Design an enzyme around this catalytic site. Structure first.
Site, PDB file in Angstrom:
ATOM      1  N   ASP A  38      30.207  21.212  20.351  1.00 10.83           N
ATOM      2  CA  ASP A  38      30.238  22.663  20.321  1.00 10.83           C
ATOM      3  C   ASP A  38      31.645  23.098  19.979  1.00 10.83           C
ATOM      4  O   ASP A  38      32.599  22.318  20.068  1.00 10.83           O
ATOM      5  CB  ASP A  38      29.806  23.290  21.646  1.00 10.83           C
ATOM      6  CG  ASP A  38      29.397  24.740  21.488  1.00 10.83           C
ATOM      7  OD1 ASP A  38      28.230  24.996  21.099  1.00 10.83           O
ATOM      8  OD2 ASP A  38      30.249  25.618  21.740  1.00 10.83           O
ATOM      9  N   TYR A 155      24.951  35.912   4.308  1.00  7.35           N
ATOM     10  CA  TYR A 155      24.119  35.152   5.230  1.00  7.35           C
ATOM     11  C   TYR A 155      22.920  34.544   4.517  1.00  7.35           C
ATOM     12  O   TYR A 155      22.680  33.335   4.601  1.00  7.35           O
ATOM     13  CB  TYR A 155      23.666  36.025   6.393  1.00  7.35           C
ATOM     14  CG  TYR A 155      23.129  35.201   7.535  1.00  7.35           C
ATOM     15  CD1 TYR A 155      23.926  34.254   8.157  1.00  7.35           C
ATOM     16  CD2 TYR A 155      21.817  35.350   7.972  1.00  7.35           C
ATOM     17  CE1 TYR A 155      23.439  33.488   9.200  1.00  7.35           C
ATOM     18  CE2 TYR A 155      21.323  34.594   9.009  1.00  7.35           C
ATOM     19  CZ  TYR A 155      22.135  33.654   9.622  1.00  7.35           C
ATOM     20  OH  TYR A 155      21.640  32.873  10.648  1.00  7.35           O
ATOM     21  N   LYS A 159      22.442  30.454   3.671  1.00  6.58           N
ATOM     22  CA  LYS A 159      21.342  29.709   4.255  1.00  6.58           C
ATOM     23  C   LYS A 159      20.317  29.304   3.208  1.00  6.58           C
ATOM     24  O   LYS A 159      19.601  28.311   3.395  1.00  6.58           O
ATOM     25  CB  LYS A 159      20.692  30.529   5.369  1.00  6.58           C
ATOM     26  CG  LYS A 159      21.658  30.900   6.524  1.00  6.58           C
ATOM     27  CD  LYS A 159      22.110  29.686   7.319  1.00  6.58           C
ATOM     28  CE  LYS A 159      22.334  29.995   8.797  1.00  6.58           C
ATOM     29  NZ  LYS A 159      22.316  28.724   9.597  1.00  6.58           N
ATOM     30  N   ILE A 188      14.343  33.838  19.036  1.00  9.37           N
ATOM     31  CA  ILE A 188      14.165  33.109  20.293  1.00  9.37           C
ATOM     32  C   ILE A 188      14.548  34.006  21.467  1.00  9.37           C
ATOM     33  O   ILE A 188      15.556  34.721  21.406  1.00  9.37           O
ATOM     34  CB  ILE A 188      14.998  31.805  20.309  1.00  9.37           C
ATOM     35  CG1 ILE A 188      14.239  30.629  19.702  1.00  9.37           C
ATOM     36  CG2 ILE A 188      15.402  31.420  21.701  1.00  9.37           C
ATOM     37  CD1 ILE A 188      13.488  30.906  18.418  1.00  9.37           C
TER      38      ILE A 188
END
Lengths: 244, 241
Positions: A38, A155, A159, A188
């Site tokens: 991380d 973005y 992607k 989510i």
């Protein structure tokens, strides 16, 4: 069962919370040895530790996936502590809605973060995978990669490049016994309010939000030998729709 | 662990041999009672009996998926036998290369066999799937649905219909807790200059039936309870035409 990760070392980046944390937990309970990773060093160790006090094998180190030294430290920390690398899950990335007139560095950053980093990690893990017989690479894309909308210049097109890299490099890494796929996750449940939620589900046929576990099972399947013959695929995991 | 089909009743059509045989067998060991179906009645009965004597539950049926009387028989046969229906694997289907000047009976048949049949079987099963608490539909499609080539006028575009129908009815039956997905298989060794395809399959290998069955098992499993309207291509990382 072929949905198990026996005798496997898996690097999982961006794994302090949400999807990557569940992927890391899930990959451990399937019997893989996990190198949690991380940007925030505390968070990587929190998850690597909870994995250990629950039976699995796991270490966690700080990693800025855009730092070439931090990348090579993770590769080495995994070989040093576990002997091989067989699974790379590229979950580090970010970005979101920006104006079209965004400063160029904003646009360029999105590609450094979402594409340049995980290409390079794959470039490093690939020859170690080859030596171990083979392995599986999994890139966590985004649904903006196959959609079109406003404020999506950096973005959605960075992607998109993740998706197409995945489709292309499987030709490069198949001969070495490496499979490369991608999950594009829906929204989510995280918040760690009810009316703005009920609106989000107006376009999700299955009628609920996602769970991190929902992404981790797909990540599991795609990285287990149960998916021995799947490569180059972009699997969308979003209850059949799109959100927000 | 979430990859099992416990207390499930799955109809698998065209499952005398090949991919459907592997699916049926895989689905049985995973916990499902299975209604094995094929054009050849006794081919289906042999599959059902193996599952039974290997430890599972299953029956075998004659079923022509293009005939509405058979379709209803199979649906009723599943309910009378097991009380519910929760998984439907639309695997039967046929065709292949055809000239562009083909007779319209061939073109139409390809849609009747590859598309109408599985949509109709989806219609018959959806209400029972909802009464049962939820379920999954899996359509066995073909990479010809996204590939473009000579001689694919009937086959390629019927299978392309199966792909978009999959994506589109996912919105329709999702509110009933039904997932709908598809698997597009590549070159599966089912039954020498073989090396043609291999020169375009990045993983250096043809597919076996069990590869298709593993993805099948996943997409009908609770491990994929939040996956819908997907066409998962299972092809070794490439294309083989």
């Amino acid at each position: 069962s072929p949905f198990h990760l026996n005798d496997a070392v898996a690097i999982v980046t961006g794994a302090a919370a949400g999807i990557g944390r569940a992927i890391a937990g899930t990959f451990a309970k399937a019997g893989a040895s996990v190198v949690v990773t991380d940007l925030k060093s505390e968070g990587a160790e929190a998850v690597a530790a909870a994995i250990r006090q629950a039976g699995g094998k796991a270490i966690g180190l700080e990693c800025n996936v855009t730092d070439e030294q931090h990348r090579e430290a993770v590769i080495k920390a995994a070989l040093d502590q576990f002997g091989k690398i067989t699974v790379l899950v590229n979950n580090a990335g970010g970005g979101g809605p920006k104006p079209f007139d965004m400063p160029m560095s904003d646009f360029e950053w999105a590609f450094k973060l979402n594409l340049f980093s995980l290409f390079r990690l794959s470039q490093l893990a690939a020859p170690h995978m080859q030596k171990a017989g083979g392995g599986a690479i999994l890139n966590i894309s985004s649904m903006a990669g196959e959609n079109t909308n406003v404020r999506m210049a950096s973005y959605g097109s960075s992607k998109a490049a993740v998706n197409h890299l995945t489709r292309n490099i499987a030709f490069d890494v198949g001969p070495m016994g490496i499979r490369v796929n991608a999950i594009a996750p829906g929204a989510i449940k995280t918040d760690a309010t009810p009316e703005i939620e009920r609106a989000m589900l107006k376009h999700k046929p299955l009628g609920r939000l996602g769970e991190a576990q929902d992404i981790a099972n797909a990540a599991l399947f795609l990285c287990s030998p149960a998916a021995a013959w799947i490569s180059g695929q972009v699997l969308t995991v979003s209850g059949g729709g799109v959100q927000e």
